[PDB]
Amino acid sequence: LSNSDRFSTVPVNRAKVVQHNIKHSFDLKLHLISLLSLLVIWILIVAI
Amino acid sequence: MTDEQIYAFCDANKDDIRCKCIYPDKSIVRIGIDTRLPYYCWYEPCKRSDALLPASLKKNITKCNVSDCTISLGNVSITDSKLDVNNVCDSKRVATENIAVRYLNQEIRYPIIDIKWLPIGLLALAILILAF
Amino acid sequence: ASLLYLILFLLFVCISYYFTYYPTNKLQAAVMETDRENAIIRQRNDEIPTRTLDTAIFTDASTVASAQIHLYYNSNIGKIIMSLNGKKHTFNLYDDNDIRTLLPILLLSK
Amino acid sequence: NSLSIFFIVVATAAVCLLFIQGYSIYENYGNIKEFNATHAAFEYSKSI
Amino acid sequence: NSLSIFFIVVATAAVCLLFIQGYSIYENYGNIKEFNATHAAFEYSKSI
Amino acid sequence: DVHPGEPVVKDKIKLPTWLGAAITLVVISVIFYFISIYS
Amino acid sequence: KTSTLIFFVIILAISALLLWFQTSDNPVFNELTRYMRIKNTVNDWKSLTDSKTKLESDRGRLLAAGKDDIFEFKCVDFGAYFIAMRLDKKTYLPQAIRRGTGDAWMVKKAAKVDPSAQQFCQYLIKHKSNNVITCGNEMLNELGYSGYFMSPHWCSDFSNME
Amino acid sequence: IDRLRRANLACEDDKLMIYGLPWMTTQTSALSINSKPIVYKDCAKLLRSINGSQPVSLNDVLRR
Amino acid sequence: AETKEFKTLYNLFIDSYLQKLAQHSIPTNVTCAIHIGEVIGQFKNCALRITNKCMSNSRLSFTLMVESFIEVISLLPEKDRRRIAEEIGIDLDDVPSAVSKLEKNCNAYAEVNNIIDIQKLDIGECSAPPGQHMLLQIVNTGSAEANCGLQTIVKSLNKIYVPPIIENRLPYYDPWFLVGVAIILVIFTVAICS
Amino acid sequence: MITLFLILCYFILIFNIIVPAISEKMRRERAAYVNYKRLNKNFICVDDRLFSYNFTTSGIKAKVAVDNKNVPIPCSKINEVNNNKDVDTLYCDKDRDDIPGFARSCYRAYSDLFFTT
Question: Which residues lie on this side of the membrane: Virion surface (chain B)?
């Protein structure tokens, strides 16, 4: 029982735990990064 | 409550289900003896949560069907791996490949440049006067 | 030409969007195809109800009786199982004899 | 010509935006690593 | 005229960084307030 | 199952990710346009 | 003209660096791409669950033909435990006796032939049968998993056996 | 069954008949449970009391 | 990194045998021990699992072992399951509650006690699909003859061929040569245009 | 200089999207093949046909079991099908039109492979 307090009598919805860990986590903005990179390339090649 | 109070209370009420394996019938004790299984390890009132037990009964129940199995590892050195020493010697089955997920209460760092940059940045703007 | 350049850029955008936001392996693309296909399969299959449907039934060449039947249509083998009096008979929708047996029991549902 | 300077200024703005995004990722690399270590199994899984 | 272009781009970088920092601070001021409140002892350790 | 703890983090009302970039680009362009016009 | 060529070369070099980091065994790029992959997979879990539940519904409809005894509670033995299960009359999915707010009741067996486990499963069939749990979408919305893609499990084992 | 939707029931003299069959254009007699020809003189009245005087196609039966 | 266990035939056999031992667990007065002098692991995703069961009734131990082995090869092709069966020394047509050739061969460990002593152990390469790990087990039991059967069956299951995951990522070294060449060629095209 | 912009676009597309996409697709299909051959072998039953999955240079491929006269083998005798390793196999890459819904069965075979692995 040296680890009795780390187990919960109630069932655990681990799927919701993972969903919350993903909801409240850092968001790598690849869409914004890609759009900005495309704009930079177009401006540096075509506009200038 | 103390052991003496337990004995006095259970002698006052010897038919209470709460105290029925501290003072069980001789029949139960000798059935347990004749089966090579002590009665306090299987007799239901002992297993009851609200049942009151003395010190001796508790320290004898704590040795109920206890095994003797040991693991003696030496110098263990693992890298990028997982070590799971189970040493399990009972009916309980260890939950293999059971991913234990906790709540990652992650604290998001923000892209705040050290505001000591504020003077230097101003200097940057200042150098436009060189282009005038 | 300007039109060719615009077409090439649009093709670029479409291909990049597909490769980023859509599956690129046979397994997941096949799963999506199977999802759409099974949706169509069931949209066609649900038209056949399993409820107790009253109909005229011909036990012999000169006998008729009104009774309730159940119908279950499957497309893996394309057959209709008709349940009557606790017994299920399977009729194929491709065999002539099965079609001739099953058409009157469906078209005469009271 | 003012249009060329405008395009250069917009390119610098977009590059600064990209640098800020990269700085965000650099700051949150620890969170990224912690999330990966905790949620490594679900990389290719089909259920929890 | 390379020097003028370099001055313009660096000043634009400074101004754009100022605006990015201002907007990020505007949106995350409360967040950093609770971050500092719940981690007040992390500013200066008592073992100086 | 192992107890997962409690969800301390709260779901605050966020803002669009592109919106800060949009404001930055728009304000830079407006500042440049006013500077060019007045000059 | 000259600036355009300089920027062309610079962008080509940037793309070459990005390809170098992508192909090589860089831990940083590995962490970033694993972050993205885990997020995408957890996102796709829902669609995978829907597809598997629907396909299992079709196979349950096909399987439950000419067998009225599979629609009633039976004490299915899983080699180590008994479960009182049946097929739901609506969704045609495995539906078993639920243990409180958890999964299906697993009567642990102490031997290959355990009469007490069977007796207790019958007792649950006759007394505690109002609380049930069904594999599929109810399973997903209650306990977080679909029952499928999980091995060993009573949904998957019952689908494979039947 | 989409092909079979065009099928409908009528009377070939004193027997049941299925018109609108693309599977077999030739005249075929409907089969009963024991796969035998159906010969009723009153089958027309039964059709009138279920589908109507006009031969109702299987498409309308499915639409029911 | 919390990764799933990559299920494999011998791993399934070991886990089924362990579950059967646990569900027929009986108290015993014999001391069962594992003593490993050195444990060395230097490869990623090389999970190590040291489970210490021990059931004194070795006859039931072989019964459960044969039952688990039979349930494992219930999914293999018929020719492969049968040939592996004669290689191990177990016959499917015989009831698991019977003495087989493997048990007779491994009875030579009855005198020795139920202790697992390893002077030094090192975990080799463990190629696993991403998101999963290759898990290796060191399982003790209440008789050295049951252990004999355990390792011989584990080796026989290891003898099968399972396709490996091949790593296509190139080794990474800090690429200053690329940026240096880029700078040099930028200077070159600047000179060319000028 | 829009053409140079398009050249840069396509270069980045190929060497930063398509090549990693090829590697990712190979990795996923190889993982599925490994999880398939670690327990299952030879042919498996899908839509009354029999399919096996083998890994080649251009990904995973599903081949269906057929008899001498190019007719798919019914599932019921998979037993003997596992006994005879010289049974005729037809690849799913080629859209062969004699079999009704051949590509349907191939797609369902890939879907079942994904679900099982």
Answer: 1-111
